[model samples]
Target: KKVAIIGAGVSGLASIRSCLEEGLEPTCFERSDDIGGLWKFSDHAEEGRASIYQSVFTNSSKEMMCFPDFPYPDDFPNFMHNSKLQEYITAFAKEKNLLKYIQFKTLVSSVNKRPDFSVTGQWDVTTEKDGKKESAVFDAVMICSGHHVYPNLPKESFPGLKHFKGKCFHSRDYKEPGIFKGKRVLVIGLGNSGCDIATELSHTAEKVIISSRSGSWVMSRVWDDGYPWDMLFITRFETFLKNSLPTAISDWWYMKQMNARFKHENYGLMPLNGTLRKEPVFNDELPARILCGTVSIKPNVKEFTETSAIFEDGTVFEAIDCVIFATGYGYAYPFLDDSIIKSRNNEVTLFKGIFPPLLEKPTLAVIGLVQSLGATIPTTDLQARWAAKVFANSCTLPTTNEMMDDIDEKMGKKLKWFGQSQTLQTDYITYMDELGSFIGAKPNIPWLFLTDPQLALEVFFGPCSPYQFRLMGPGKWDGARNAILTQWDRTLKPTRTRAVGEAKRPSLFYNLLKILLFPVLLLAVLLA
Candidate 1:
């Protein structure tokens, strides 16, 4: 089978490899001159450059960001800067000999399905390289264009943004601190980018003001002993047991470890919601800027003038030089015709957001569309593998109507929880689990079982991690388990000793007692 891949980013690279593994020829089209979508750093142009931002360090560790088979070098920093990540991607591609299949500077025009909607989808792809228009046809196509293309800046939210005379730009266009030296800068949005930029700007800016309509929970990277805090719970055992364990049990155990630095009451169950809290993670010298008054938090902006910002609370602050909007991006597929790729209420309707239900077979697949608390590469790999399996007839696609109904139902549930604000919300881990289950990737634990199980189990019980899923089902679950265990042991020194010690403790005493007294409690309640 011949396949066409859009975008040469991490997701596209994963898909290309997946196709190759299945003995299919895949052609990759990269619109840009190089790989590494956001990771590619560019110098600041005199007008300001959008390719790289001021604070663009990865949130997750290099270990998590890397592909399962190709681990990042041990000596690499836990959190890599944009340039480092780009280098890693380029090196991986070269080592794998993948560049031969990629056509650089090739922009895809449009991909459309034939009227018959047959199993073999024909794509008419147009590209411009060296100022010449070229077209190609492929048996299948994978849209890995990613969700970071268009910036989601709703101009309606800011009434007087145009009136701002001083330099004002989206976080996308921000490059370095040199421009903002001794200048007051207001950073809008409180996501990772906003927080990181705010922290970075505090060093050179005269004063940095971070505006948040509602605050986000700020998690620390370090613990009291100066150890990286995330290391405590990101253990091999935790990954292995997460699938088999009850949701409540998993949440409790993870929360217990996290609560060591920040109280549960202060951060809530889903701690992602809380604003800045007193946790050792953010207590580092860098974050001490908040206490020193170098960085100040302001309420949401109501309006803006040439040199001032009016807050919703009727407070106004002077803007010395520039304003940076760290707003997120719009998930779009510009290469696909709008008619075939339909969206409703800001949600893209696709079967698992990979296969369009209207299509007869899985002629096209999407990778790396989902957002999660963990790494994206593993999830993309899993999705690509699943798509390849379906293509090879090793797996079957769901009936079109059935898939559509499922997508609708899932979207309904999502809207009920998050409402229609277009803000992406979901625990990274939870999102991964859901995606893993949808494609039958591996360790398919029911959502209800994960949330509330009759018995508490290890956090690693289900599809411990994405790697485990790739090894497990879609094939032999045991072989996959053993292979993953071997890797875990090699890297992490995994031992049964840790699991045995945890079992002996029996941490859920209250739940155990409740279960033991069920019969007596039932009788007493009936008698009453």
Candidate 2:
């Protein structure tokens, strides 16, 4: 049977690879000329290309961003820059021989359920390249076009946006800080892009002011002390702690960790919506910039003029040379009919963010649509693999009624913790476990902890590396277990700076320190 893959970016590539592994033939259509999805950058926001500022580094670490089957080379840093991503994705495609199946510069115009889908279980797809059109039928469809294509401007969501006469541009259009040299800039939204863009402009702009309706909790990329931030936190054991402890104790423990670094309120960034509802800001430079008076933050925009903006607190900012809306994006699948699936604002009612619940055949799936705290590459990789299994009839979904009830429960939980906009947002560990469970790839932590304590501690205390899921079941790899065990050794190798063709993977150390100390440390936390 054949499969149709729309959008040959990260999620699209993952879909193609997973389909191949399951012995299903896949044809990938990309409107762009190459692969790498969002990793492939342009100076301007082209019609189908994902754009970013020239200096942008991935906010998520390399450890969190890779497919479990394929680990990034040891030489790359824990957190990678944009250029490194370009290099990595190119290598990833060539390694898998996936280039031959992908049709670049080909646009998928529509995907419709065929009349014979119930019998043949196939789809009718229309595509155009240059000026010619073609129609094809496939057994299944994976829409991996990603959610970032359509940018949501502040004008659509903010009241005073229309009156703001300053040259307003969306963050998608912002390339570098060069155009704003010596100009005053007001960046809206406190999410990842807002803090990142504002921090960069603080160096180039006359002054950079940040405006947020809901302020954010900002922190450094590096964790408590020199460890990659995510590595030490977000483990299975940590999730256990968050669930097991009383709400007040858990909240106090986390707030204490944050206050030790910087007080959110003292820096003008404490959220009115409360910390539980706010998504974090992950830039090391933001709070420092605020402390040094180079960057300042204010409440939501209340009014605006061609040259100035007035905030909700009645504080006015003068001569705003430019306004950059780092506000988020909306979900838009223009090729498909509105009847197929419609997202109101950014909310999509999908089962586990993978399957569209209303479809009768269950052959349509979407990947990388969720906004997560960690990198989405791994999450989408799992989604594509699970989807491949579903398409092959090697996996089973719950009853339609059960899945419908699940959609209500999932969206209900998000609304309780945060607001409506973040219904797709998820905790990396919790959601990854959900995806892995479907594919039988979920790691058995207790089994490992009992048989091999050292490796178990690494699995539980180390960063929740994507490789751990590959240690057992469906897409198991010999390299993944070792990849998880000796992670720190590989992390150390890059900083050592091996010249062009030297040994890439580093040596795993059997140091006395970790062997001697962690179980007691692990016990200490549980006992208390």
Candidate 3:
């Protein structure tokens, strides 16, 4: 069967590989003549593509974010720049020979259902390249176009914005910090980009004020003893503890861990008391910058004047030279019909965040629509694997009514956990396990423990690497076990640059305790 994949980003590239593995033909349509969708940095921002600032470094460490079956070179930094990521992506496409299946500079115009939709699960896809238009029919479609392209700038909220004499633009338009030299900049919003831009601008700007409505909890990519945060926190054991422990005890433990670095209230970045835990921003420098007085936090702006912004508390900040609205992004499928995937209030309704529940045939899957707490690379790859399997008829989905019921329940939990405004955020391990289970890729913990206790220990206690999914599944890879075993060596190799006299290590007693705790861990997975 022919499959049409939209976009050539990480998700699209993964979709191509999965379809090929399933023995299906996949043709990827990318608007730009490139494979690394948003990761490719250009001097100027493209009209319909996602853009990032020049100073962007990946928030997640490379070990936690790399694609399964392919590891980053041992010499590269744990947290890499966007250029390094682009290089990795280019290498991946070239290594897999995926570029041959992609049509660069081709834009997907529309995807309409075939006239005999009830009989066959097919789509009429129309695309345009240069001045010519073309149409093709495919048995399945995967929407890999990401969500960061459309800027969510709510100009209506600030009434006097028209009177602002200074420069104002969305975060998507921000390329580098050189343009704001010696200017008083007001960055509106506290997402990852907002905090990053504010900290970067503080070096050159006269004063940088970060105006957040609800405030945020800021964390660093570097974790205890200089390891990656995800490497330490995303283990199955830790996630099980989070789920199995009482809510009051778990919440308290979480707050305690978060506040250990520094007091959020002292830094003026604490979230409100009783509100859902919004996703925290990853920044190692923001707190230091705040303490140094180069950057400060402010309440949400009530209105904007010609050269200043008035806060909700009636405090006015004067001489604001530029305003950067880092208010996140909204998603849409301009080429697809609304009935297929309609997004309301920036939230998409889908069964397991992939297949649209209302469709007669489950041939269309939206590949990277989720925003989990951990890395997106593994998440999207897992999603693509399941989607490809479903398209190839190697897997089956639930009935439409069952899917709709599941969707309703998932959304209700999301609202209760992340609040109404945040629709895309989800737990990393929970969602990944669900997607993996669909493809029979989720590792069988009890079976692993019986056959290989060493591998089982790493699977439960070490970083939840994507390789674990390949341990026992329809698409199992032979090298997955070795990959899991050597992950710690790969993680430590990048940072071990110099020879020092006898590096300190964790206590030997601590290691023994973990070994003895394997039985308890096994029981936890069984109960789970």
Among all candidates shown, the one with the greatest TM-score: 3
Q: Is candidate 1 or candidate 3 better by TM-score?
A: 3
Q: How much lDDT does each candidate structure score?
A: 0.64, 0.80, 0.85
Ranking by lDDT: 3, 2, 1
Model 1 lDDT-worst window of ten? 274-283
Off by over 4 Å in 1: 44-50, 115-120, 223-287, 343-347, 420-465, 473-528
Better of 2 and 3 by lDDT: 3
Residues 1-528, candidate 2: write the lDDT tens digits: 599999888899889999999999999999889888787777778875567777778767777778877878888888888889988888888999889889998999989889977777689999999889999999999999988868887476666667767788888988888888899999988888898899999998898999998787776777654566666555676677666878687777666666668788899988675537345778989877988899999998888876788899999999888999999787778788776565334346678888877677878888888776667788888888899999999897888879878878877767765666346787678888888898998988888878877777778766788898788888888888788877777666777665666544422243322553577778788788
Between prediction 1 and prediction 3, the one with superior lDDT is 3
TM-score comparison, 2 vs 3, better candidate:
3
lDDT of 3 at 393: 92
List TM-scores for all candidates, in order: 0.77, 0.91, 0.94
RMSD (CA, Å), each prediction: 7.1, 4.4, 3.9
Candidate 2 versus the native: TM-score? 0.91
Cα lDDT tens digits, model 1, 483-524, are 444332332322233553332211322333246357787888
- Candidate 2 has an lDDT of 0.80
